[PDB]
Design an enzyme around this catalytic site. Structure first.
Site, PDB file in Angstrom:
ATOM      1  N   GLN A 105      46.829  36.097  37.857  1.00 29.20           N
ATOM      2  CA  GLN A 105      46.320  37.412  38.235  1.00 29.20           C
ATOM      3  C   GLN A 105      44.805  37.486  38.135  1.00 29.20           C
ATOM      4  O   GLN A 105      44.162  38.122  38.967  1.00 29.20           O
ATOM      5  CB  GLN A 105      46.945  38.515  37.399  1.00 29.20           C
ATOM      6  CG  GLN A 105      46.417  39.875  37.786  1.00 29.20           C
ATOM      7  CD  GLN A 105      47.245  40.980  37.232  1.00 29.20           C
ATOM      8  OE1 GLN A 105      47.630  40.954  36.078  1.00 29.20           O
ATOM      9  NE2 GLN A 105      47.526  41.962  38.042  1.00 29.20           N
ATOM     10  N   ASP A 108      43.445  35.418  41.037  1.00 25.91           N
ATOM     11  CA  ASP A 108      43.703  36.223  42.206  1.00 25.91           C
ATOM     12  C   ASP A 108      42.654  37.300  42.372  1.00 25.91           C
ATOM     13  O   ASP A 108      42.091  37.459  43.451  1.00 25.91           O
ATOM     14  CB  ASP A 108      45.063  36.874  42.084  1.00 25.91           C
ATOM     15  CG  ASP A 108      45.559  37.504  43.358  1.00 25.91           C
ATOM     16  OD1 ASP A 108      45.505  38.745  43.489  1.00 25.91           O
ATOM     17  OD2 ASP A 108      46.019  36.751  44.233  1.00 25.91           O
ATOM     18  N   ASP A 110      39.739  37.510  41.340  1.00 28.50           N
ATOM     19  CA  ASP A 110      38.409  36.991  41.580  1.00 28.50           C
ATOM     20  C   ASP A 110      38.251  36.689  43.070  1.00 28.50           C
ATOM     21  O   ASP A 110      37.167  36.843  43.629  1.00 28.50           O
ATOM     22  CB  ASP A 110      38.196  35.730  40.741  1.00 28.50           C
ATOM     23  CG  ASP A 110      36.755  35.286  40.698  1.00 28.50           C
ATOM     24  OD1 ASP A 110      36.205  34.892  41.751  1.00 28.50           O
ATOM     25  OD2 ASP A 110      36.175  35.302  39.595  1.00 28.50           O
ATOM     26  N   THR A 184      34.101  38.582  46.519  1.00 30.25           N
ATOM     27  CA  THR A 184      33.578  37.296  46.959  1.00 30.25           C
ATOM     28  C   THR A 184      34.686  36.246  46.999  1.00 30.25           C
ATOM     29  O   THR A 184      35.529  36.190  46.114  1.00 30.25           O
ATOM     30  CB  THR A 184      32.460  36.802  46.026  1.00 30.25           C
ATOM     31  OG1 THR A 184      33.010  36.530  44.731  1.00 30.25           O
ATOM     32  CG2 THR A 184      31.342  37.836  45.902  1.00 30.25           C
ATOM     33  N   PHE A 186      34.404  32.995  46.687  1.00 32.58           N
ATOM     34  CA  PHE A 186      34.187  31.918  45.724  1.00 32.58           C
ATOM     35  C   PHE A 186      34.810  32.246  44.367  1.00 32.58           C
ATOM     36  O   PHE A 186      35.002  33.411  44.029  1.00 32.58           O
ATOM     37  CB  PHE A 186      32.692  31.630  45.606  1.00 32.58           C
ATOM     38  CG  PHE A 186      32.008  31.512  46.938  1.00 32.58           C
ATOM     39  CD1 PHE A 186      32.064  30.326  47.659  1.00 32.58           C
ATOM     40  CD2 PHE A 186      31.333  32.605  47.495  1.00 32.58           C
ATOM     41  CE1 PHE A 186      31.446  30.218  48.899  1.00 32.58           C
ATOM     42  CE2 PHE A 186      30.716  32.505  48.728  1.00 32.58           C
ATOM     43  CZ  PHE A 186      30.777  31.307  49.435  1.00 32.58           C
ATOM     44  N   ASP A 188      33.886  32.657  41.267  1.00 32.68           N
ATOM     45  CA  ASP A 188      32.570  32.851  40.672  1.00 32.68           C
ATOM     46  C   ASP A 188      32.516  33.961  39.608  1.00 32.68           C
ATOM     47  O   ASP A 188      31.479  34.632  39.460  1.00 32.68           O
ATOM     48  CB  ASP A 188      31.592  33.179  41.785  1.00 32.68           C
ATOM     49  CG  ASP A 188      32.010  34.395  42.568  1.00 32.68           C
ATOM     50  OD1 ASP A 188      33.095  34.931  42.303  1.00 32.68           O
ATOM     51  OD2 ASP A 188      31.269  34.838  43.449  1.00 32.68           O
ATOM     52  N   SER A 190      33.486  36.836  39.620  1.00 36.14           N
ATOM     53  CA  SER A 190      33.073  38.120  40.175  1.00 36.14           C
ATOM     54  C   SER A 190      33.846  39.291  39.580  1.00 36.14           C
ATOM     55  O   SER A 190      33.339  40.411  39.572  1.00 36.14           O
ATOM     56  CB  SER A 190      33.135  38.142  41.710  1.00 36.14           C
ATOM     57  OG  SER A 190      34.412  37.730  42.168  1.00 36.14           O
ATOM     58  N   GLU A 258      45.000  47.778  35.208  1.00 38.76           N
ATOM     59  CA  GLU A 258      46.297  47.904  35.893  1.00 38.76           C
ATOM     60  C   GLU A 258      47.506  47.678  34.966  1.00 38.76           C
ATOM     61  O   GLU A 258      48.611  48.177  35.221  1.00 38.76           O
ATOM     62  CB  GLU A 258      46.341  46.956  37.087  1.00 38.76           C
ATOM     63  CG  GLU A 258      47.516  47.176  38.012  1.00 38.76           C
ATOM     64  CD  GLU A 258      48.735  46.324  37.667  1.00 38.76           C
ATOM     65  OE1 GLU A 258      48.604  45.147  37.264  1.00 38.76           O
ATOM     66  OE2 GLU A 258      49.849  46.846  37.812  1.00 38.76           O
ATOM     67  N   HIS A 351      54.071  37.778  41.240  1.00 36.82           N
ATOM     68  CA  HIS A 351      54.888  38.984  40.996  1.00 36.82           C
ATOM     69  C   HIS A 351      56.279  38.692  40.498  1.00 36.82           C
ATOM     70  O   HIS A 351      56.902  39.547  39.877  1.00 36.82           O
ATOM     71  CB  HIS A 351      54.996  39.853  42.235  1.00 36.82           C
ATOM     72  CG  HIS A 351      53.703  40.476  42.629  1.00 36.82           C
ATOM     73  ND1 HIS A 351      53.409  40.828  43.927  1.00 36.82           N
ATOM     74  CD2 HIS A 351      52.609  40.782  41.893  1.00 36.82           C
ATOM     75  CE1 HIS A 351      52.197  41.350  43.970  1.00 36.82           C
ATOM     76  NE2 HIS A 351      51.689  41.328  42.750  1.00 36.82           N
TER      77      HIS A 351
HETATM   78  C1  HEM Z   1      52.544  43.034  35.682  1.00 39.81           C
HETATM   79  C2  HEM Z   1      51.622  42.369  36.374  1.00 39.81           C
HETATM   80  C3  HEM Z   1      51.228  42.858  37.783  1.00 39.81           C
HETATM   81  C4  HEM Z   1      51.234  44.103  38.292  1.00 39.81           C
HETATM   82  C5  HEM Z   1      51.668  45.366  37.541  1.00 39.81           C
HETATM   83  C6  HEM Z   1      50.765  44.020  39.672  1.00 39.81           C
HETATM   84  C7  HEM Z   1      50.627  45.046  40.590  1.00 39.81           C
HETATM   85  C8  HEM Z   1      50.120  44.953  41.890  1.00 39.81           C
HETATM   86  C9  HEM Z   1      49.927  46.042  42.852  1.00 39.81           C
HETATM   87  C10 HEM Z   1      50.277  47.527  42.619  1.00 39.81           C
HETATM   88  C11 HEM Z   1      49.401  45.525  43.974  1.00 39.81           C
HETATM   89  C12 HEM Z   1      49.006  46.248  45.291  1.00 39.81           C
HETATM   90  C13 HEM Z   1      49.877  45.758  46.446  1.00 39.81           C
HETATM   91  C14 HEM Z   1      49.498  46.446  47.732  1.00 39.81           C
HETATM   92  O1  HEM Z   1      49.207  47.684  47.688  1.00 39.81           O
HETATM   93  O2  HEM Z   1      49.501  45.755  48.802  1.00 39.81           O
HETATM   94  C15 HEM Z   1      49.241  44.102  43.760  1.00 39.81           C
HETATM   95  C16 HEM Z   1      48.720  43.227  44.680  1.00 39.81           C
HETATM   96  C17 HEM Z   1      48.518  41.873  44.538  1.00 39.81           C
HETATM   97  N1  HEM Z   1      49.021  41.078  43.524  1.00 39.81           N
HETATM   98 FE1  HEM Z   1      49.744  41.735  41.768  1.00 39.81          FE
HETATM   99  N2  HEM Z   1      50.493  42.689  39.952  1.00 39.81           N
HETATM  100  C18 HEM Z   1      50.765  41.962  38.813  1.00 39.81           C
HETATM  101  C19 HEM Z   1      50.638  40.613  38.655  1.00 39.81           C
HETATM  102  C20 HEM Z   1      50.213  39.693  39.585  1.00 39.81           C
HETATM  103  C21 HEM Z   1      50.087  38.257  39.402  1.00 39.81           C
HETATM  104  C22 HEM Z   1      50.451  37.501  38.102  1.00 39.81           C
HETATM  105  C23 HEM Z   1      49.622  37.743  40.566  1.00 39.81           C
HETATM  106  C24 HEM Z   1      49.304  36.284  40.976  1.00 39.81           C
HETATM  107  C25 HEM Z   1      49.575  35.213  40.217  1.00 39.81           C
HETATM  108  C26 HEM Z   1      49.443  38.830  41.499  1.00 39.81           C
HETATM  109  C27 HEM Z   1      48.989  38.722  42.796  1.00 39.81           C
HETATM  110  C28 HEM Z   1      48.645  39.752  43.650  1.00 39.81           C
HETATM  111  C29 HEM Z   1      47.834  39.626  44.825  1.00 39.81           C
HETATM  112  C30 HEM Z   1      47.189  38.371  45.407  1.00 39.81           C
HETATM  113  C31 HEM Z   1      47.743  41.022  45.425  1.00 39.81           C
HETATM  114  C32 HEM Z   1      46.927  41.372  46.702  1.00 39.81           C
HETATM  115  C33 HEM Z   1      45.421  41.267  46.392  1.00 39.81           C
HETATM  116  C34 HEM Z   1      44.616  41.648  47.608  1.00 39.81           C
HETATM  117  O3  HEM Z   1      44.619  42.848  48.006  1.00 39.81           O
HETATM  118  O4  HEM Z   1      43.959  40.758  48.189  1.00 39.81           O
HETATM  119  N3  HEM Z   1      49.817  39.991  40.870  1.00 39.81           N
HETATM  120  N4  HEM Z   1      49.691  43.787  42.499  1.00 39.81           N
HETATM  121  C1  LIG Z   2      47.044  42.030  41.164  1.00 41.19           C
HETATM  122  N1  LIG Z   2      47.331  43.107  40.813  1.00 41.19           N
HETATM  123 CA   LIG Z   3      35.037  35.657  43.509  1.00 37.46          CA
END
Ligand code: HEM
Ligand SMILES: [C-]#N
Ligand SMILES: [Ca+2]
Ligand SMILES: *[C@@H]1O[C@H](CO)[C@@H](O[C@@H]2O[C@H](CO)[C@@H](O[C@@H]3O[C@H](CO)[C@@H](O)[C@H](O)[C@@H]3O)[C@H](O)[C@H]2NC(C)=O)[C@H](O)[C@H]1NC(C)=O
Ligand SMILES: *[C@@H]1O[C@H](CO)[C@@H](O[C@@H]2O[C@H](CO)[C@@H](O[C@H]3O[C@H](CO)[C@@H](O)[C@H](O)[C@@H]3O)[C@H](O)[C@H]2NC(C)=O)[C@H](O)[C@H]1NC(C)=O
Ligand SMILES: *[C@@H]1O[C@H](CO)[C@@H](O[C@@H]2O[C@H](CO)[C@@H](O[C@H]3O[C@H](CO)[C@@H](O)[C@H](O)[C@@H]3O)[C@H](O)[C@H]2NC(C)=O)[C@H](O)[C@H]1NC(C)=O
Ligand SMILES: *[C@@H]1O[C@H](CO)[C@@H](O[C@@H]2O[C@H](CO)[C@@H](O)[C@H](O)[C@H]2NC(C)=O)[C@H](O)[C@H]1NC(C)=O
EC number: 1.11.1.7
Length: 595
Positions: A105, A108, A110, A184, A186, A188, A190, A258, A351
């Site tokens: 997370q 991600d 970053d 960003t 990278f 980094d 951020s 969050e 997730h």
């Molecule tokens: C309990 C832990 C977590 C909660 C409560 C949570 C919650 C959320 C929520 C509410 C969103 C918004 C989705 C949307 O509106 O499209 C999101 C997006 C996302 N989640 Fe998580 N998340 C958790 C853990 C993780 C983990 C461990 C990862 C990766 C290993 C992850 C990867 C992502 C990614 C890549 C996005 C989209 C980011 C973007 O907008 O570019 N999440 N998450």
């Molecule tokens: C990722 N929330």
């Molecule tokens: Ca970054």
């Protein structure tokens, strides 16, 4: 092509051309093309977008337009039939700590953040979205299927707003819709420093000339710092307990608060900057605040890069690690460091690693108090449980001593995320992360499963028999096909997450390819990558090669007993050594001698 340069919130300036420090916004990294990998530019596209009208309308919108001859299933219904489960027993990963989940997370956060469409200050679009479930402009509701238990108790739908996009934010004309990446590309750090010049500054302690990040002045954790409170009102974090009045933390990335565990590692990371900065002032009394901040930042980012590539990925990617990320051969400026749209979904494999509860443990890794173990759903935007209930030490111990959840085809996402999720905008803990993901693939114009399988040179199943072979699972292939009618229509997030794991890793072949590719790129295309000759001296790399998350805990908490390898499952006490057995980061090569 068309408009080889649309432009939104794209900010200020040009390149200092010979500066050893990254810019905040990520500009000026690549020299031929300065904006490559910078913040709030379009997410890149490794494949052309797929909308209902080949421009911007999501599949599933017009509830009579097919996708390849067939109706796309409601997102929440896939959630109810494929993704859900009840029995939480046997679900834990026998060889990954909670930290493995948590680091993904942070990485991600970053790399990518696609913000939702605002236009929502003194507004009633949100009303027409929440209350009356009216599909609109930006309002793209997740409707409840037939006999969904949430119909009886919540309403007819969950509100959901479409992602922000490039040219303006008043919508429909000229090219195919691209979503914005507000951070960003990278790796980094951020999420610590900010991705915009203004916030990066509010985050700094500019009173002293010491180069520190600002810290909280209301509250302390046994003498150790906390992030400052965000004072924007109203606050999601005040809301979940108005009796305690504890606001959300204010860090480099907006989503820092969050859930209690993410906020914890953000604190840890903030504390490391300050540590580095007052350490770098001891060795170099002549350095001013800007140089302290900068030299600190630079080391922290390398740390993120080091922990991520040395310890994280080899245990996510498995035997596929070498296939997609071969040994570093230096900076290559033909390589596109931008994050792709499909990556922001591919990295959501995380997730399904999220477990149902969080624990606090005393100095003996025993339950800390009457309510040591809490349901995850009570910890979304929960900072009162940190400030007013034991600090981060009990939470960090939980991270080391507890297991992540294992990805299970029969048990995909826990009900804490699947039914009881909290969203900042709204008032109920009643949202669906799995529905939300699937609705978002559509929103972002994701091509389907087989199309990505094809992109990664993998077999493209066409029939039940062939889907069963890919998924090694007759029953999931059937459930998947009753809903989608053909594998071509399988949304990417679920398609890629249904696949069996690769030997010694935690994702399947398709995802290993998608993640592999992206990480390889953000590495090779970063001019400031830590192993690029000239970014750090030989003496500095040799010394950075020794960092580990175990040490980070030692130097920034009062946890005195930690595992050598923090990412794998470790039992107490056999696997825990004293903090004195853990290599330090030697800061001597940073000592600047004058004459
Ligand atoms: C309990 C832990 C977590 C909660 C409560 C949570 C919650 C959320 C929520 C509410 C969103 C918004 C989705 C949307 O509106 O499209 C999101 C997006 C996302 N989640 Fe998580 N998340 C958790 C853990 C993780 C983990 C461990 C990862 C990766 C290993 C992850 C990867 C992502 C990614 C890549 C996005 C989209 C980011 C973007 O907008 O570019 N999440 N998450
Ligand atoms: C990722 N929330
Ligand atoms: Ca970054
Ligand atoms: C909202 O947050 C407040 C914290 O600000 C929560 O109230 C807290 O409730 C617990 C018990 O329910 C109190 O602990 C009690 O006292 C001692 C701890 O030193 C312990 O020995 C007892 O067994 C007992 O647990 C705690 O002091 C109290 N905090 C204050 C200052 O009011 C409340 O639970 C939260 N409410 C919601 C809506 O979640
Ligand atoms: C739980 O996960 C651990 C993390 O991967 C894993 O430790 C890994 O153990 C293997 C041992 O085979 C190491 O792999 C290397 O082993 C030898 C070097 O001694 C070489 O011949 C191999 O080619 C290979 O490079 C890994 O280094 C090590 N992983 C890490 C990152 O520490 C445990 O095996 C897992 N535990 C169980 C019970 O399955
Ligand atoms: C910006 O950096 C400042 C300098 O490091 C820092 O000021 C320092 O703040 C601490 C705590 O407010 C003070 O130290 C002590 O204060 C009382 C005694 O009056 C003790 O109870 C505390 O435990 C603590 O040790 C220092 O006096 C002060 N240092 C200096 C040089 O003035 C600010 O806190 C930083 N500002 C932000 C927003 O982070
Ligand atoms: C930098 O990376 C690029 C892009 O991957 C590499 O460029 C390849 O170069 C060959 C010819 O040598 C071309 O046929 C290909 O078009 C390129 N590969 C692809 C598929 O993009 C190159 O290997 C790297 N350059 C250096 C100097 O390492």
């Amino acid at each position: 092509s068309w408009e080889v340069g649309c432009g939104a919130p794209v900010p200020l300036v040009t390149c200092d051309e010979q500066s050893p420090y990254r810019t905040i916004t990520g500009d000026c990294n690549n020299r031929r093309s300065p904006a490559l990998g910078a913040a709030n530019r379009a997410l890149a596209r490794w494949l052309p977008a797929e909308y209902e009208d080949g421009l911007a309308v999501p599949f599933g919108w017009t509830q009579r337009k097919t996708r390849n001859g067939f109706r796309v299933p409601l997102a929440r219904e896939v959630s109810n039939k494929i993704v859900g489960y009840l029995d939480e027993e046997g679900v834990l990963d026998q060889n990954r700590s909670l930290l493995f989940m948590q680091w993904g997370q942070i990485v991600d956060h970053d790399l990518d953040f696609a913000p939702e469409t605002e236009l929502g200050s003194s507004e009633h679009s949100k009303v027409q979205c929440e209350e009356y479930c009216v599909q609109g402009d930006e309002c793209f509701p997740i409707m409840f299927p037939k006999n969904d238990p949430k119909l009886k108790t919540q309403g007819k739908c969950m509100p959901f707003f479409r992602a922000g996009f490039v040219c303006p934010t008043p919508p429909y004309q000229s090219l195919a819709r691209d979503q914005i990446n507000a951070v960003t590309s990278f790796l980094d750090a951020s999420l610590v420093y900010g991705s915009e010049p203004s916030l990066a500054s509010r985050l700094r302690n500019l009173s002293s000339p010491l180069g520190l990040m600002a810290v909280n002045q209301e509250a302390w954790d046994h003498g150790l710092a906390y992030p400052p409170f965000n004072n924007v009102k109203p606050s999601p974090c005040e809301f979940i307990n108005t009796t305690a009045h504890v606001p959300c933390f204010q860090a480099g990335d907006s989503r820092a608060s969050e859930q209690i565990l993410l906020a914890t590692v953000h604190t840890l990371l903030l504390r490391e900057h300050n540590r580095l900065a007052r350490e770098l002032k001891r060795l170099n009394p002549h350095w001013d605040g800007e140089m302290l901040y900068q030299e600190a930042r630079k080391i922290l980012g390398a740390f993120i890069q080091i922990i991520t590539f040395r310890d994280y990925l080899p245990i996510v990617l498995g035997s596929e690690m070498q296939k997609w990320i071969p040994p570093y051969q230096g900076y290559n400026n033909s390589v596109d460091p931008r994050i792709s749209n499909v990556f922001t979904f591919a990295f959501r494999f995380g997730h399904m690693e999220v477990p149902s509860t969080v624990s606090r443990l005393d100095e003996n890794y025993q339950p800390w108090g009457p309510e040591a173990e809490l349901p995850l759903h009570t910890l979304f935007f929960n900072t009162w449980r940190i400030i007013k209930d034991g600090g981060i030490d009990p939470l960090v111990r939980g991270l080391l001593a507890k297991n992540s959840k294992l990805m299970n085809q029969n048990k995909m996402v826990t009900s804490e995320l699947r039914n009881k999720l909290f969203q900042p905008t709204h008032k109920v803990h009643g949202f669906d992360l799995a529905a939300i993901n699937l609705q978002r693939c559509r929103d972002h114009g994701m091509p389907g499963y087989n199309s990505w399988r094809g992109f990664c040179g993998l077999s493209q199943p066409k029939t039940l028999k062939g889907l069963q072979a890919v998924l090694k699972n007759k029953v999931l292939a059937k459930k998947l096909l009753d809903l989608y009618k053909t594998p071509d229509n399988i949304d990417i997030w679920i398609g890629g997450n249904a696949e069996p794991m690769v030997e010694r890793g935690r994702v399947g072949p398709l995802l290993a390819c998608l993640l592999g590719r992206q990480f390889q790129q953000i590495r090779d295309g970063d001019r400031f990558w830590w192993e690029n000759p000239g970014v750090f001296t030989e003496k500095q790399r040799d010394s950075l090669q020794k960092v580990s998350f175990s040490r980070l805990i030692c130097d920034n908490t009062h946890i005195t007993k930690v595992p050598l390898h923090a990412f794998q499952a470790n039992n107490y006490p056999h696997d825990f050594v004293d903090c004195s057995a853990v290599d330090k980061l030697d800061l001597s090569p940073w000592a600047s001698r004058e004459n």
